[PDB]
Design a binder for this molecule. Structure first.
Ligand SMILES: Nc1nc2c(ncn2[C@@H]2O[C@H](COP(=O)(O)OP(=O)(O)OP(=O)(O)O)[C@@H](OP(=O)(O)OP(=O)(O)O)[C@H]2O)c(=O)[nH]1
Ligand SMILES: [Zn+2]
Ligand SMILES: [Zn+2]
Lengths: 57, 90, 50, 1160
């Protein structure tokens, strides 16, 4: 709900891929070097359909 | 063909095949049986082949045919040795 | 509106939330959760506007 | 009966997962010790990371100990230490392996966007797949009671479920648990049941995940790879030489980070092995397993999770993947500062003596030993090392007809590297021909170029028949000449015209060459008078040949003498009768099209020599009094300031809108600027008075600066306007304009204020320049990456359809015609004629036959022409459909390389593009090629029907238009925002405008048509070059748009699985092989799909070519999953492999090899 709606509605498509934005709108412990790659992989490349492969994952 | 080389392409379309066949002929001259057709005049083997192609002689079919004759000359004229070897292993 | 979206309700939960935000790992205590926030904007050895 | 077992020729390479036994096949031993080199003896340990028995010997042919030394025992291993004494390069190729205790997951197939180990198993990645193998939550491996098959349990749930049942549903946890999970998985039976279930009564609410996984599962099962290999139990080792520890200077070894990784994984793995033999505390052993996982994951691919460290460096360690995720130095090369060489020809270059000496070193050696002189090879070395005069003469022989190709730093297009004939020059700098100094975009600011020596025989001929400067007369981008004379030479030839009245003139007539004697012998001037002479012209017609034509024309001294340079043909005189400006290139152009290559080249050399010589004779300089300021300057300024004063006074007393008086006063200073500019130009242009016979007359100023301006030679109106006139409205950092323009000029003094204002323009100018210069190449890379695979093949196919070419006319409301866009184009079919006959079918519009399209009057302004956009070709490009536009006058040779040349030509003028309902600039070009939807896209009628409102705002909603007619309706969605253009009841056509706004290329291609969308892109991309004034042929744009429309989408029912969007390549080749195969009903109908350059380049057959530009870690992995193979026709992927390129000089090789690979 929160993560899905915020990610999708905001990123349309953030133009310059504003990375420093939604990473703060994410819960749990931050400043990790793990969740970094899981966001730079979904925004571009396989556009549209990738944004549906993200939530399901 | 020190400056086109363009006068040779219309003799055999697509400059690329021109380079191939010319390199082929130049390969024959630089190493092995030389014997140029157009007078050397102190020119490298690179251009000599191009001048020949421009002259009208030495093309693709020409070289292939002369290669056929070359093979029929090396093989058929020296078969006395190979035939003697054919009886080697029965 | 800021208060409406604020999980914390007192001083303890606030310092604990900050301690968990700054140093994500070890379980926030009493001394650590306080000393950490104090050594951010209220200590010369950890903060100085010159 | 072949079946050879050696390292011969390969036709393709395959990529897939590797079994533990597969790893053993590479294993030349097992690393068992973290030890590397000895602390004292500096000798490779027994079974360490640098073993001698496992990998390779240190020295070449002597073993570790020394029982055997020379080549005596090259096949026999040592007795005391099993060391195969072969080479030292063996140490570079030998593999080896490490066999871990407990199973370990491969970091790539685990966490790399899609969970390959998860998606194949259908299980959450960093959520469930993490907690079950990190020793936390046990997982099930198939249960026939209460428990499913892939649920997650806790230790409490485990023991509870074990107590309820147990001993009949055993399911471990950790690595080996996931191993048994993948192993137990049956791809076949699941492939069947999934096909069954995911097809039973389900709309578009499920079909997504259904088709996705089923295609993925089918791919994996067909790949051949077993899911067991997903997590490795045996980890191979990289050769020591590819990660050595070489001693540097005075001790201080230098090793690779991989040694640290392998050492760590070896340590943790050994402790894990030891713990599984001693006391076995569950927590300790399980932790060591997680630590082993850490080591392995760090070694394979660091990334990615915290980043392992150590090694004293605060920076991370370069893992295996990091060494292959993200410039080819070459022998026989050099570089130096360039210098102008006027006395040189068009096919020659100034090559330094010492430089050329070191370059052809091996050739000098061989030639020396060939003739005599040097007794041996080393004798030649000692003979050239001691430059002994005679060696130089030998050098003059080796560099005789051995072409050397030059190259400049910014390589935008094909003319970045051009070949020349080496000419020895006593100096240490490289001289270049000033004509081809424009193609390089090179200046003599201190710029330096590089030189390469074509070693191969066919490489020399390649440089002579292709890369030779004489073969690059015309630009690949635009058919116009590229070696056209520039500043100095054109200025000279401009001075050789310029008819001046009287002044040692008179009509003293002679006969051409004789006039030369008149010029040197003084008496007469040079720029007179006019004067008449006998010109022997030459023309040809119909049956070619030559037809003389002696006459008496009224030229000048310069024109007469300059006429000698003109070749046999040409209209003569009239080409010289003009002047020197832009026709200077026109003359060169016509000379090429009516004569040929060689004549054009020698003509270029002659006009260059003549230009330079007479330019020096002229002595044109630039004094301070050459830039004469207008007398009406202060008058105009005062009048303008008077007007603005009145406006300011009005603003003081209200009246006029003070909110925008800023704009209107700007118009005042802007108008005033035009007044000063017009005044200065009208002054500096004509002037003079002379004194012809009875005196009193007017010509045009001989004012040096004007002479430079009216003859190219770097001198524009704006620059001159700033020299004597004034610098107009200046820009402000806010983006606004200052209401106080630079009244002064460079001829005059400049106040500190206005200069501190101009510094902003200069700063932003250099800054913006630095951006667009790199941004241009940034676009070029995408262009090339997407297009560098298509090559003109299969000679000339059929087909007649093609975009109807028409002159780009803005003349609808502004008047601007351009009708030269049809030339060297192959005609579709006899494009009519106001009567009958005329144009043939496949007849390519000649350069002289395009001028025949003017004899058919202005009535005929539309001709159908075959283009690369259409063309019923398969995996190439029809020769006819392309064109001919090259440095060559004929059609493109079969097997060229249209892609790269097209991309280069497009991204070449990118340097001169100003970035910003009109965006404009480079960014506009990028957006057009990427096919991006506008910020306010218009809407069109998909099917022709009757426009009517579909429930006024009843959703949701927002208005709704429903064009219904014939059969079936459509309900589009209008979001209230933005109005309309068609009232209710009115009828529309198939693709009518109902928003009157920015059009989206996707909608155009989808509805309007391919010809329409391609016409849109080309006519919209040109409009941004029109303003920038950069000429570029439409062919290349059509070329990139060709593969820009590479893939499509099928919508019906056929051998292809419906929803899959595939390229029209396999589509067309398969639809042609189905209408006459079994039945046309076993295939569907496709629909073209517009996709951007990036999106198009993303899709490609080769996995190696893909591994090039896009993210390697992704493509390599996914290509590893399914048994894919590159085989192997791509240009890019065939470059890194180091073989002949499937194009140009190659192609024939690839063609023969391609047909050769049909036997099996
Ligand atoms: N088209 C053509 N030209 C040839 C051929 N052989 C020689 N040339 C010309 O030879 C000219 C150079 O003559 P030289 O400078 O004296 O060198 P050579 O000693 O003549 O060598 P050579 O025996 O002829 O092969 C070039 O001048 P340029 O006028 O081109 O240089 P440019 O127009 O810039 O003056 C070439 O055009 C040929 O087979 N075909
Ligand atoms: Zn030994
Ligand atoms: Zn075609």
């Amino acid at each position: 709900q929160s993560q899905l709606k915020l990610l999708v509605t905001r990123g349309k498509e953030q133009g310059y891929l504003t990375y420093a934005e939604v990473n703060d709108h994410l819960p749990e412990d931050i400043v990790d070097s793990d969740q970094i790659e899981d966001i730079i992989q979904m925004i571009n490349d396989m556009g549209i359909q990738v944004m549906e492969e993200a939530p399901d994952a | 063909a020190r400056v086109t080389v363009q006068d040779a392409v219309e003799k055999i379309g697509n400059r690329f095949d021109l380079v191939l066949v010319a390199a082929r002929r130049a390969r024959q001259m630089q190493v092995g049986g030389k014997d140029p057709l157009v007078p050397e005049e102190n020119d490298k083997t690179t251009v000599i082949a191009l001048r020949e192609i421009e002259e009208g002689l030495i093309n693709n079919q020409i070289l292939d045919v002369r290669e056929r004759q070359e093979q029929q000359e090396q093989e058929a004229a020296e078969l006395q040795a190979v035939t003697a070897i054919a009886e080697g292993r029965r | 509106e800021t208060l409406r979206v604020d999980p914390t309700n007192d001083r303890l939960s606030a310092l604990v939330e900050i301690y968990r935000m700054m140093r994500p790992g070890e379980p926030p205590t009493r001394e650590a959760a306080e000393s950490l926030f104090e050594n951010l904007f209220f200590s010369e050895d950890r903060y100085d506007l010159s | 009966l072949k079946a050879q077992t050696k390292t011969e020729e390969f036709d393709a390479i395959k990529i897939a997962l590797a079994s533990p036994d597969m790893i053993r096949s590479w294993s030349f031993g097992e690393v068992k010790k973290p030890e590397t080199i000895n602390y004292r003896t500096f000798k490779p340990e027994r079974d360490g990371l640098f073993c001698a028995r496992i990998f390779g010997p240190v020295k070449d042919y002597e073993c570790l100990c020394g029982k055997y030394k020379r080549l005596k025992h090259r096949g026999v291993i040592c007795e005391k230490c099993g060391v195969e004494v072969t080479q030292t390069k063996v140490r570079r190729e030998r593999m080896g392996h490490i066999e871990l205790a407990s199973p370990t997951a491969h970091i790539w197939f685990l966490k790399s966007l899609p969970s390959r180990i998860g998606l194949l198993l259908d299980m959450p990645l960093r959520d469930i797949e993490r907690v079950l193998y990190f020793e936390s939550y046990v997982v099930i491996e198939g249960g026939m009671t209460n428990l499913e098959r892939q649920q997650i349990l806790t230790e409490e749930q485990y023991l509870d479920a074990l107590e309820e049942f147990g001993d009949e549903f055993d399911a471990k946890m950790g690595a080996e648990a996931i191993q048994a999970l993948l192993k137990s998985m049956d791809l076949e039976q699941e492939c069947e049941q999934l096909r069954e279930e995911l097809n039973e009564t389900n709309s578009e609410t499920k079909r997504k995940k259904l088709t996705k996984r089923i295609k993925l599962l089918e791919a994996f099962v067909q790949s051949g790879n077993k899911p067991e290999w997903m997590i490795l139990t045996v980890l191979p080792v990289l050769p020591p030489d590819l990660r050595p520890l070489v001693p540097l200077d005075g001790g201080r070894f230098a090793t690779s980070d991989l040694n640290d990784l392998y050492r760590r994984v070896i340590n943790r793995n050994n402790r894990l092995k030891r713990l599984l033999d001693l006391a076995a505390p569950d927590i300790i052993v399980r932790n060591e397993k997680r630590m082993l996982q850490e080591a392995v994951d760090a070694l394979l691919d660091n990334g990615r999770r915290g980043r392992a460290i150590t090694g004293s460096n605060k920076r991370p360690l370069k893992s295996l993947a990091d060494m292959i995720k993200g410039g080819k130095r070459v022998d026989y090369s050099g570089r130096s500062v360039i210098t102008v060489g006027p006395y040189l020809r068009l096919h020659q270059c100034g090559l330094p003596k010492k430089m050329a000496l070191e370059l052809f070193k091996p050739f000098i050696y061989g030639k020396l030993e060939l003739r005599g002189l040097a007794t041996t090879i080393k004798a030649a070395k000692k003979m050239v090392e001691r430059e002994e005069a005679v060696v130089w003469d030998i050098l003059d022989e080796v560099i005789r007809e051995h072409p050397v190709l030059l190259n400049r730093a910014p390589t935008l297009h094909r003319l970045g590297i051009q070949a020349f004939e080496p000419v020895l020059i006593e100096g240490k700098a490289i001289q270049l021909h000033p004509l081809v100094c424009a193609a390089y975009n090179a200046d003599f600011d201190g710029d330096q170029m590089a030189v390469h020596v074509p070693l191969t025989l066919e490489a020399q001929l390649e440089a002579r028949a292709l890369m030779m400067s004489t073969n690059n007369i015309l630009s690949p981008a635009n058919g116009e000449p590229i070696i056209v004379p520039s500043q100095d030479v054109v200025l000279g030839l401009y001075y050789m015209t310029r008819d001046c009245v009287n002044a040692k003139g008179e009509g003293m007539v002679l006969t051409g060459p004789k006039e030369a004697e008149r010029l040197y012998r003084s008496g007469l001037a040079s720029l007179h008078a006019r004067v008449k002479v006998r010109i022997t012209e030459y023309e040809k017609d119909a049956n070619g040949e030559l037809v003389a034509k002696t006459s008496l024309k009224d030229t000048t001294v310069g024109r007469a003498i300059l006429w000698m340079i003109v070749p046999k043909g040409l209209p003569y005189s009239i080409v010289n009768q003009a002047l020197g400006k832009k026709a200077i290139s026109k003359m060169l152009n016509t000379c090429y099209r009516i004569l040929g290559l060689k004549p054009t080249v020698i003509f270029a050399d002659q006009i260059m020599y003549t230009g330079f010589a007479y330019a020096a004779r002229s002595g044109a300089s630039v004094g301070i009094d050459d830039m004469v300021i207008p007398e009406k300057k202060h008058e105009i300024i005062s009048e303008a300031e008077a007007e603005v004063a009145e406006i300011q006074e009005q603003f003081q007393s209200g009246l006029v809108t003070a909110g925008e008086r800023y704009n209107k006063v700007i118009d005042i200073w802007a108008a005033a600027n035009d007044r000063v500019s017009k005044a200065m130009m009208d002054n500096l242009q004509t002037e003079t008075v002379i004194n012809r016979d009875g005196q009193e007359e007017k010509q045009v100023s001989f004012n040096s600066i004007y002479m430079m301006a009216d003859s190219g030679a770097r001198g524009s109106a704006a620059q001159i306007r700033q020299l004597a006139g004034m610098r107009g409205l200046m820009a402000k950092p806010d983006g606004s304009i200052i209401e106080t323009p630079i009244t002064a000029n460079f001829r005059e003094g400049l106040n500190v204020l206005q200069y501190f204002i101009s510094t902003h323009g200069a700063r932003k100018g250099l800054a913006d320049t630095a951006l667009k210069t790199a941004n241009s190449g940034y676009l070029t890379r995408r262009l090339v990456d997407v297009a560098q695979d298509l090559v003109v093949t299969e000679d000339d196919c059929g087909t007649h359809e093609g975009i109807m070419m028409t002159p780009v006319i803005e003349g609808g409301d502004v008047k601007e015609p351009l009708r030269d866009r049809v030339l060297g184009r192959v005609t579709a079919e006899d494009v009519l004629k106001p009567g009958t006959a005329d144009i043939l079918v496949p007849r390519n519009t000649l350069l002289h036959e395009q001028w025949c399209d003017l004899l058919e009057e202005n009535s005929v302004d539309a001709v159908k022409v075959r283009s690369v956009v259409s063309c019923d070709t398969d995996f190439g490009v029809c020769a006819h459909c392309y064109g001919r536009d090259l440095a060559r006058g004929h059609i493109i040779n079969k097997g060229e390389a249209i892609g790269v040349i097209a991309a280069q030509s497009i991204g070449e003028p990118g340097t001169q593009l100003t970035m910003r309902d009109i965006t404009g600039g480079l960014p506009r070009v990028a957006d057009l090629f990427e096919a991006r939807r506008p910020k306010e896209p218009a809407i069109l009628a998909e099917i022709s029907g009757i426009v009517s409102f579909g429930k006024e705002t009843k959703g949701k909603r927002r208005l709704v238009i429903t064009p219904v007619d014939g059969s079936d309706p459509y309900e589009e969605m209008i979001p209230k925002w933005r109005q309309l253009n068609v009232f209710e009841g009115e009828r529309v056509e198939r693709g009518d405008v109902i928003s009157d706004g920015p059009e989206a290329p996707h909608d155009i291609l989808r509805l309007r048509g391919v010809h329409a969308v391609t016409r849109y892109i080309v006519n919209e991309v040109q409009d941004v070059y029109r303003l920038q004034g950069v000429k570029i042929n439409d062919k290349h744009i059509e070329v990139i748009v060709r593969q820009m429309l590479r893939k499509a989408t099928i919508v019906n029912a056929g051998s292809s699985d419906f929803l899959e969007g595939e390229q029209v390549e396999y589509s067309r080749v398969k639809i042609a092989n189905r209408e006459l195969e079994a039945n046309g009903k076993v295939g569907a109908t496709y629909s073209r799909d517009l996709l951007g350059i990036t999106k198009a380049s993303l899709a490609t057959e080769s996995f190696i070519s893909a591994a090039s530009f896009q993210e390697t870690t992704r493509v390599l992995t996914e290509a590893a999953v399914a048994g894919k193979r590159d085989e192997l026709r791509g240009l890019k992927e065939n470059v890194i492999v180091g073989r002949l390129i499937p194009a140009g000089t190659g192609y024939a090789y690839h063609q023969d090899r391609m047909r050769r690979r049909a036997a099996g």
